[PDB]
């Protein structure tokens, strides 16, 4: 409890606040703290460094802010910062009970984005924009989507676009590819789950062309089905988030899935002398292991962009997505047509418990009573069209698993924006 | 390929991953001496090697990848051995429009799942040619291996059960020396191309 003790002598006045690392404690201050009055360590710049992009839960940031710690967190409703603060640094710097004080506030704004930039014994540097632009100079540079760039076309001619789809699922591709209004000359698609499936083969009349598993198919398979345009393929997470006690890797269990992708990618690629526009998209978990990451990167030799549905859907999720689209680390452009609160998705007379959700307990609310979201609000909420996914006989639970685990339609509209004027259009 | 006349030959040029046979290169007559400087650039950790990284290291004519040897520590999931010299192999072909003789082999001592040697023979595309060790006719060691190197099916064996293989596997634990004897003479019908000595 070293901490604890030091924290509780700077509150005493026989220390200053500035000579201590206010993160882990330390009195090795190599740094000033960019976000706080108080000094910080090499460990926690590291630290501070790695974790910043380490820690990203899905929705939120997950942190803490300050130690890097931390189990029971405060969350900003400030949909530009999404910054959270742990309950133990709150009670241990700033004051007891400050935590309690904090909570009780629904809309609750973190300390970087309240009015106040003193709270307690916390306070906050005016200049730390540009001093986490400092800060941050020795990482994430090896990061963030460096996109390169293919050559227009024009109208006449253009042909229709042919896309292969490794581990579809709910035919989000080809939905978003309709939507778009670019002719589809083929939609090859590997798919397992049966339900996902047949809700393919329903919801696009059977234009899809389905395979085995990516590992039944091979680099024959591949230029036999003609040659490919755009490959998609978001390869299931699982042992790859770091929420999975029994998490097997990126190289075990349902990680391997991965190479699968990243072989089918490398037997679709034109060769040299193809100036051939081609255009591939990878979409995974941010929970996912530092470790794991790093590999997938470099077997992709790319790096992703950190998508979230928040600017765009009610929900706020976030996804890593690696590949060479336009427009690739673009900012979120939200439509008219996009409903952006809960509350826009819900049934008629039923409330919204909070303003995006992230499945935050029960988030609606009906005749005075609390309750589960619903499937046919929950496709508004991922932005697939109503009762799109009503299909079969398939269970709730299964199709709410379905949707679960599915892209959400306005991100990936956002992502095959710009891929109109590559292709046919109608 | 096409075979390559005798005042044509060149030094070859390896490249060895996880495990280092420039021993047997060497004793080949692949490989002549003084580093050497270079022929044979070996690296047993490449979670950091970049696509330049490999293109800087001159080009390449021979790319060896090995699994540890039979119950050798644990390291890293044997599946990384497989897909990294995947990666860095196609790191290390030659332009599709600049052709020239290039040859890989990847070679597993029994360290490899079921599961993990159906991903080998379909990222390899080819099945694993199994050359035992046999003594007083008895499986003593085994190795198996995925290469383009010409003679090579012309191996491979028969009688090595699968079942006996994987359990030639269990009968040896811990100790472990790999089995190099297995995979030199592998190397053969490369001298077709590359100088002697
Ligand atoms: N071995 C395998 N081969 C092909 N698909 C698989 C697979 N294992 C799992 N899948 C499928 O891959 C999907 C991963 S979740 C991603 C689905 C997709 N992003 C969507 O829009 O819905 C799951 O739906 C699962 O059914
Ligand atoms: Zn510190
Ligand atoms: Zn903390
Ligand atoms: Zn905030």
């Known amino acids: 409890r070293t901490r604890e003790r030091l924290v509780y002598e700077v509150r005493q006045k026989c220390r200053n606040i500035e000579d201590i690392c206010i993160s882990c404690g330390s009195l090795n201050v190599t740094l000033e703290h960019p976000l706080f009055v108080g000094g910080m360590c090499q460990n926690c710049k ?18 803490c802010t300050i130690c890097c710690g931390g189990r029971e967190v405060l969350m900003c409703g400030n949909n530009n910062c999404c910054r959270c603060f742990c309950v133990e640094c709150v009670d241990l710097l700033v004051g007891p009970g400050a935590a309690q004080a904090a909570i009780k506030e629904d809309p609750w704004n973190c300390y970087m984005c309240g009015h106040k930039g003193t709270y307690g014994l916390l306070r906050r540097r005016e200049d730390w924009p540009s001093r986490l632009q400092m800060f941050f100079a020795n990482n994430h540079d090896q990061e963030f989507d460096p996109p390169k760039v293919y050559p227009p076309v024009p109208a006449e001619k253009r042909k229709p676009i042919r896309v292969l789809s490794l581990f579809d699922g709910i035919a989000t591709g080809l939905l978003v590819l309709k939507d778009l209004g670019i002719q589809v000359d083929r939609y090859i698609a590997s798919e397992v789950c049966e339900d996902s499936i047949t809700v393919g083969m329903v919801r696009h009349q059977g234009k899809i062309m389905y395979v085995g598993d990516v590992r039944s198919v091979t680099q024959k398979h591949i230029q036999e089905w003609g040659p490919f345009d755009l490959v998609i393929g978001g390869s299931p997470c699982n ?78 999720r976030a996804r890593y997505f ?25 049934e008629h007379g039923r409330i919204a418990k909070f303003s995006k959700v992230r499945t935050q307990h029960f988030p609606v609310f009906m005749n005075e009573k609390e309750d589960i979201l619903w499937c046919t609000e929950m496709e508004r909420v991922f932005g697939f069209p109503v009762h799109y996914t009503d299909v079969s006989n398939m269970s709730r639970l299964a199709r709410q698993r379905l949707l679960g685990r599915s892209w959400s339609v306005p991100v990936i509209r956002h992502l095959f924006a710009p891929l109109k004027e590559y292709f046919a259009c109608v | 390929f096409e075979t390559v006349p005798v005042w044509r030959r060149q030094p070859v040029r390896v490249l060895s991953l996880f495990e280092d046979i420039k021993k047997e290169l060497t ?16 690296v047993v950790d490449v979670t950091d090697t970049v696509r330049k990284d490999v293109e800087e290291w001159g080009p390449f004519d021979l790319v060896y990848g090995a699994t540890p040897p039979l119950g050798h520590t644990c390291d890293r999931p044997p599946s990384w051995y497989l897909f990294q010299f995947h990666r860095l192999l196609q790191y290390a072909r030659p332009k599709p429009g600049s052709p020239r003789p290039f040859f890989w082999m990847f070679v597993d001592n029994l360290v490899l799942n079921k599961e993990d040697l159906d991903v080998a023979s379909r990222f ?50 811990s100790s472990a020396k790999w089995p190099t004897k297995l995979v030199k003479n592998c190397f053969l019908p490369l001298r077709e191309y590359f100088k002697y000595f």
């Open chain 1, 239 to 316: 042992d790859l988030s770091i929420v999975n006690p029994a998490r097997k890797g990126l190289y075990e269990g349902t990680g391997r899935l991965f190479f699968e992708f990243y072989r089918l990618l490398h037997d679709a690629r034109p060769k040299e002398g193809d100036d051939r526009p081609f255009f591939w998209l990878f979409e995974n978990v941010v929970a996912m292991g530092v470790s794991d990451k790093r590999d997938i990167s470099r077997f992709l030799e790319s790096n992703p962009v950190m998508i979230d549905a928040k600017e765009v859907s009610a929900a706020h």
């Open chain 1, 46 to 63: 590291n630290c501070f460094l790695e974790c910043a992009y380490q820690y990203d839960d899905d929705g939120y940031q997950s942190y």
């Open chain 2, 27 to 42: 004793s080949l007559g692949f490989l002549e001496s003084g580093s050497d400087p270079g022929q044979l650039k070996h």
């Open chain 1, 322 to 346: 690696w590949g060479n689209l336009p427009g690739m680390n673009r900012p979120l452009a939200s439509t008219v047509n996009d409903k952006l609160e809960l509350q826009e998705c819900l």
């Open chain 2, 124 to 173: 390899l595309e080819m099945e694993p040619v199994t050359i035992p060790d046999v003594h007083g006719g008895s499986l003593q060691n085994a190795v198996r291996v995925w290469s383009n190197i010409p003679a090579i099916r012309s191996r491979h064996w028969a009688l090595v059960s699968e079942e006996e293989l994987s359990l030639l596997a269990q009968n040896k634990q």
